[PDB]
């Protein structure tokens, strides 16, 4: 569970880096599909699946807007992300294993772009938060 300390740390960090959400998604999703190519199975319906492609780019925006939502719903991620959970559970059927992979990629992208803001304390709290985002997206799966 997230403490007040965690919540504060995530909101301060997002306050600082949110402006870069779209760039962060493109980067993180590009990293995911390059470094963990098995994740490409979920994008078999796109024309192609390549780093920084139009489709990866636009999705990267949408995924990080989902993270934006989660920061705003941080006091109740289960309720806050229920529609996204329904989509991921019933339409996409993304194995929750993959959320851990993207989460790692997000942390690496933020380290590369925000070295000074992404402190070990920022990192423990964001890692806790993303694990909670992953669990909330998994809420409607079984």
């Amino acid at each position: 569970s997230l403490s007040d300390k965690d919540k504060a740390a995530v909101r301060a960090l997002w306050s600082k880096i949110g402006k870069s959400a779209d760039a962060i998604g493109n980067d993180a999703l590009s990293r995911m599909i390059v470094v963990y190519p098995q994740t490409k199975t979920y994008f078999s319906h796109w024309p192609d699946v390549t780093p920084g492609s139009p489709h990866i780019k636009a999705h990267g925006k949408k995924v990080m807007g989902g993270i934006a939502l989660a920061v705003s719903k941080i006091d109740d991620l289960k309720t806050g992300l229920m529609e996204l959970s329904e989509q991921h559970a019933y339409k996409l059927r993304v194995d929750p294993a993959n959320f851990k992979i993207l989460n790692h990629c997000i942390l690496v992208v933020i380290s590369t772009m925000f070295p000074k803001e992404f402190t070990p304390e920022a990192h423990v709290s964001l890692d806790k938060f993303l694990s909670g985002v992953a669990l909330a997206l998994a809420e409607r799966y079984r």
């Binding site: 098995q38 490409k40 199975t41 078999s44 194995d95």
Partner: protein
């Protein structure tokens, strides 16, 4: 991997007695119910809306037996498993688009269904050898994902 003679023995033993028409359906049904996102691939299998549809689904049944018999080539090739499965791997990646983490999940279901069948005979050492074999098979199935 480097097998011990006792491990070879245990695996060969399990597979000699494997009731595939029984274990196969049970394991895939259980997987579809415990890990319902694995149903992604079986929309043409008909009704899966609940546990009962799945357990009663003859298409899942036949596919379970098939998957289980897919392990046979590894038993017959214990020192060549990664190459023996290269084409199956490529199949699951390029044409079926199956998420390879799903393999792990199915594996665990197979292990738990076999544990139900063997009971007391599914000793810790038997479980060690069996999961080792399944882990080596699963690695090989996820190998050709590019």
């Amino acid at each position: 991997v480097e097998w011990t003679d006792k491990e070879r023995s245990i695996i060969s033993d399990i597979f000699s007695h494997m009731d595939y028409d029984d274990i196969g359906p049970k394991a895939l049904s259980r997987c579809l119910i415990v890990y319902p996102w694995t149903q992604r691939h079986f929309s043409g299998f008909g009704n899966l809306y609940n546990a009962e549809a799945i357990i009663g689904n003859a298409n899942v049944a036949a596919h379970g037996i098939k998957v289980l018999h897919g392990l046979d080539r590894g038993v017959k090739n214990m020192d060549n498993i990664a190459a023996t499965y290269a084409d199956l791997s490529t199949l699951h990646s390029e044409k079926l688009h199956v998420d390879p983490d799903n393999f792990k999940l199915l594996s665990d279901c197979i292990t738990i269904v076999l544990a139900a069948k063997m009971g007391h005979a599914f000793t810790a050492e038997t479980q060690g050898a069996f999961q080792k074999f399944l882990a080596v098979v699963v690695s090989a199935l996820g190998k050709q994902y590019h």
